[PDB]
């Protein structure tokens, strides 16, 4: 929840 | 009777 | 589907279009979610090049690709996020906030969110680099509905990460700067903007009563209670955490929650099928029963005492432990009449059943509350009735077993109870 990777 | 904080 | 070796060749070509294509290939690798080669990109030395591409305002595509790629590196472990920060990425992303292209500045918002989301130090380092002014300036519209939906969601989430974490809490003077925008997002009709604002508010209300008062004088308590009654669990959870945080403060801060109608929602929350909701709602009740006697009367008036009896009877053990705390705070601060009503609701039998639990602290809390009730029974002269009452539901059996086990405080309180009312 702290971090978010952006996906396709 | 004391308030508990997280 | 490039290799890292090929990406390095493209990056070091000193050909801008080749670098753009290799960076896009790197972004595609870093954006697959089953094991992206973050450490491989870092070990290749690509991060300083990616940061330098952030400032190529002539080529906005390579800005977007580098921002996306650096965002996903910063999404990983603290070591990988540190690698992004060590490459000078923070001031570059803050400059990108002013990009005329919405998707680029949106990606700078995301990246900064990932960096501040690592912990106290990086959050404070992002603030010290001046990210708050341009972040809030992106939201300087009269009506938030005119902003793109995903754009707004990304800003709210990044702002919630700037309000997150303790040791140390965020600088008060930056919380003051953020709060008005945060209240605005808290009234915005989007379930995920709502959830993230509630998280931010819950973070800010965790700690000293001075910070609680700082959120409370902005008027957010009525909105928090409104959102407490939402059907969306991702909204109720942070909303209830914020309400629970506020009632840990002064009696006046607690009264503001009660005055907003929060108690009317608690029959729902105390029987909620989600365990952490029940546990949070019961912990909140424990801190409300630790207030003034008129506030304990509000709990009685809303009919919550039967619900506290039910949580103490059948619930998750963690929830039951918070129920034991709620009863001890109740019996410690209540009137004799309120205690009499509490016993009449049938608190004794569920209280006695937890005296066999394998937890030292809960036995302390329970045995303490038994002392409390007995002390009220002495002001009615009816200690014999309570003696036979604890008799009739296997209570003395437990207390005379607890009379002799390891912990010092339990058996000291156990012998006391036995000599004083059972002889």
Author numbering:
A (entry chain B): 435 to 442
B (entry chain C): 289 to 294
C (entry chain E): 75 to 497
What does the publication say?
Similarly, the best diffraction data for importin α1 (~2.20 Å) were obtained from crystals bound to just the p50-NLS, while a complex with both the p65/p50-NLSs or just the p65-NLS diffracted to 2.40 and 2.82 Å resolution, respectively. Interestingly, adding both p65- and p50-NLS peptides to importin α3 and α1 resulted in strong electron density for the p65-NLS peptide at the minor site, with the p50-NLS firmly occupying the major NLS-site. Unexpectedly, in all complexes with importin α1, the p65-NLS adopts a fully extended conformation at the minor NLS-site, with the P1′–P4′ positions occupied by 301KRKR304 residues; the α-helix 306YETFKS311 seen in complex with importin α3 is missing in these structures. Additionally, comparing the p65-NLS in both importin α isoforms, there appears to be a shift in the NLS register at the P2′ position. In the importin α1 structures, the P2′ position is occupied by Arg302 while Lys301, Lys303, and Arg304 occupy the P1′, P3′, and P4′, respectively, and the P5′ is unoccupied. Meanwhile, importin α1 residues 75–497 are perfectly superimposable (RMSD 0.26–0.39 Å) in all complexes of importin α1 bound to either p65-, p50-, and both NLSs, underscoring the rigid structure of this isoform7 that can stretch NLS peptides at the major and minor binding sites by making extensive mainchain contacts. Thus, the intrinsic plasticity of importin α3 appears to play a role in NLS-cargo specificity in contrast to the more rigid importin α1.
Nuclear translocation of the p50/p65 heterodimer is essential for NF-κB signaling. In the classical pathway, importin α binds to importin β through its N-terminal Importin-β binding (IBB) domain8,9 and to NLS-cargos through its C-terminal 10 stacked Armadillo motifs (Arms) that collectively form an Arm-core. Importin α possesses two NLS binding pockets located along the concave Arm-core surface: an N-terminal ‘major site’ and C-terminal ‘minor site’ between Arms 2–4 and 6–8, respectively.
